[PDB]
């Protein structure tokens, strides 16, 4: 109904660019209007909607509903089982570069992620980040162009910033956790402990007040 | 007694900081002749991480006060006693714990993740030996702690990934056995290095179970390196 | 082994955090029968408290992990046995404590601060020894505890000032023994707010620099008040 209403709305405005991506997942967690959206998207819109949202200008009345379904998309879906390990390359600066080590921030703008540690690489080589969470959508059912096996997290998802360290190459590589995760994630139970790492790590006398 | 009733106080141990007896219950395990399970295996070490561990805190401690307190011909000779008695613990549980390697775990151990954890393992406590060793025994000491981290470290390059928190472990603790026990920040650097530009080259073969493991030995490394390097 | 040579063994174990080493060597000083100096005293009781205190934790510890675990009869048993070596251990620490203080501490000590810290003390180790003790001999090591608590209470009144650090020190472990193990909030409240509105009515009298050691204990009791009335 609500759905049907953005499924309508996505055609109306798209066409069969929009119309070309219904049925892509016949297994179906997510609408009609939320595989479109997905699918437009990781098509060639997350272009121009990413550099909207990060330059926080308004939205034209085509991209609003791209971003609206893709929202339903991330609601619906939610943290998953396991944790994925999936990678974003940029050409120069990302918005994770004022986020300092141990700190959490996010990118404005929908993250937009690869299983392939090549196709990252692809899209640049200023910074390359390797991305762990649960809460992303697998939209390589949808579109998958030069099979990027994409994975994508929501906008304005806040990530933790576990490593970030240069090459000698000069890119930047970091190593980003989906926030949520916590701060016990992570960890093979108590190997820290037992690698015993060389590292380091109100009273006054003698009357046991108790 | 049972392996699982050893284990199980060994875990109830922990938790009351009986790190004693915790080490004594998973000494008993070892000396079953089986291969540890990586539970175990992480439950003797962090046992006698913390046995050994305290007589070297109490010894830097002595030895410290044996420096600040010179004037009396017996106030010092009690000191030179005192150090003494805990270098005589450092030196049995270091050889305890080294002939549980040698007899059991590092024999016994048939995948390379555990092989390399345990001739590791080999190199700290040789390196805890020559702390307090002297002469020809530093010496045998030395020597000992080199060619233990220097075989696991062979291992580690060939069965390994760049990014195992085993592999970089080691890497950190030989790196800091170069600039503490042989006293060369160029050979502590070099490996530093080496072990960290292997490891942001190849982010992409990161564990999913312990990636925030090698993240922070990897920063760890990256600190002594910035911090060796440094006027 | 001479007094001075167990002293400072004695003062080396602490900074090397050696407690049990620390605890043996203040055992020996005490065992040579002659009345222990403030720093002598300061170190037996600083050992003693280190010592029992380690398995006073070990024993809350393995207590807490025993009834939120209690799904296997085999992994329960194992529970009991550590609970057990523990209170083996917490018995033979309180009775060397207060075998000194039977034997040596308490009959050699002839001023009031000395007899009343010492009987202070000896009914600190029968209320550690309360904590774990079961039936008749839990009645037994409270009716202990209690006494000696009172014996030392009394002297504190008639010969120290009511700003001292070991009365107000006393007051603070009596009425901690009435909340904790008499279960009778009432009796602690009314020992801690006596030892503190007498402290309040007579502190005008500053200690010239002791005026900070008295302050922090006087908290202490003052804090633990305001806590109970919740
Ligand atoms: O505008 C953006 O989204 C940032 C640049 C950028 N885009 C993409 S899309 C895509 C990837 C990627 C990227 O690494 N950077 C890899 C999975 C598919």
Redesign the interface.
């Known amino acids: 109904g609500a759905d049907k209403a953005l499924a309508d709305g996505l055609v109306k405005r798209f066409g069969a660019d929009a119309e070309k991506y219904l049925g892509r997942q016949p297994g179906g967690i997510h609408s009609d209007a939320e595989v479109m959206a997905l699918g437009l998207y990781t098509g060639i819109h997350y272009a121009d909607l990413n550099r909207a949202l990060r330059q926080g200008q308004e939205l034209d009345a085509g991209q609003k509903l791209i971003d609206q379904g893709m929202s339903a998309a991330f609601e619906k879906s939610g943290q998953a089982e396991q944790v994925v390990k999936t990678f974003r390359g940029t050409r120069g600066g990302d918005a994770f570069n004022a986020v300092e080590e141990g700190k959490v921030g996010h990118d404005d703008g929908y993250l937009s992620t690869s299983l392939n540690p090549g196709v990252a690489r692809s899209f640049g080589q200023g910074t390359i980040s390797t991305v762990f969470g649960r809460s992303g959508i697998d939209v390589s059912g949808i579109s998958n162009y030069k099979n990027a096996k994409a994975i994508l997290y929501n906008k304005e998802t806040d990530m933790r910033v576990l490593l970030s360290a240069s090459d000698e190459q000069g890119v930047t590589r970091r190593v980003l956790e989906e926030a949520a995760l916590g701060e016990l994630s992570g960890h093979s139970q108590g190997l820290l402990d037992a690698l015993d790492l060389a590292s380091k790590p109100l009273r006054m006398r003698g009357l046991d007040l108790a | 007694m049972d392996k699982s009733?050893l284990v199980?106080?060994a875990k109830?141990?922990e938790?009351?900081?009986?790190y004693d007896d915790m080490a004594a219950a998973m000494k008993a395990v070892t000396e079953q002749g089986h291969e540890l399970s990586?539970?175990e295996?992480?439950?003797l070490?962090?046992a006698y991480?913390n046995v050994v561990?305290a007589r070297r805190?109490?010894w830097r401690?002595?030895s410290s006060?044996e420096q600040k307190t010179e004037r009396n011909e017996?106030?010092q000779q009690?000191?030179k006693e005192?150090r003494e008695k805990?270098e005589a613990e450092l030196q049995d549980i270091c050889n305890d714990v080294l002939e549980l390697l040698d007899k059991y775990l590092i024999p016994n151990a048939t995948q390379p993740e555990s092989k390399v954890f345990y001739l590791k393992?080999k190199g700290?406590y040789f390196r805890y030996l020559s702390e307090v060793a002297s002469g020809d025994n530093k010496q045998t000491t030395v020597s000992n702690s080199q060619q233990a981290y220097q075989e696991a470290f062979e291992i580690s390059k060939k069965e390994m990934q760049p990014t195992h928190?085993?592999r970089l472990?080691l890497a950190?603790?030989f790196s800091?056995?170069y600039y503490?026990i042989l006293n060369s920040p160029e050979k502590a650097c070099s490996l530093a290095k080496t072990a960290?530009?292997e490891a942001?080259?190849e982010?992409?073969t990161?564990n999913?179970?312990?990636?925030?493991?090698s993240?922070?030995?990897?920063?760890?490394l990256?600190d002594n390196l910035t911090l060796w390097t440094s006027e």
């Open positions: 009733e199980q106080k109830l141990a938790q009351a900081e009986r990586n539970e295996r992480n439950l070490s962090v991480k561990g805190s109490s401690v002595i006060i017996k106030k009690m000191g005192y805990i393992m700290d928190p085993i472990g950190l603790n800091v056995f503490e960290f530009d942001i080259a982010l992409d990161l999913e179970e312990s990636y925030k493991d993240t922070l030995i990897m920063q760890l990256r």
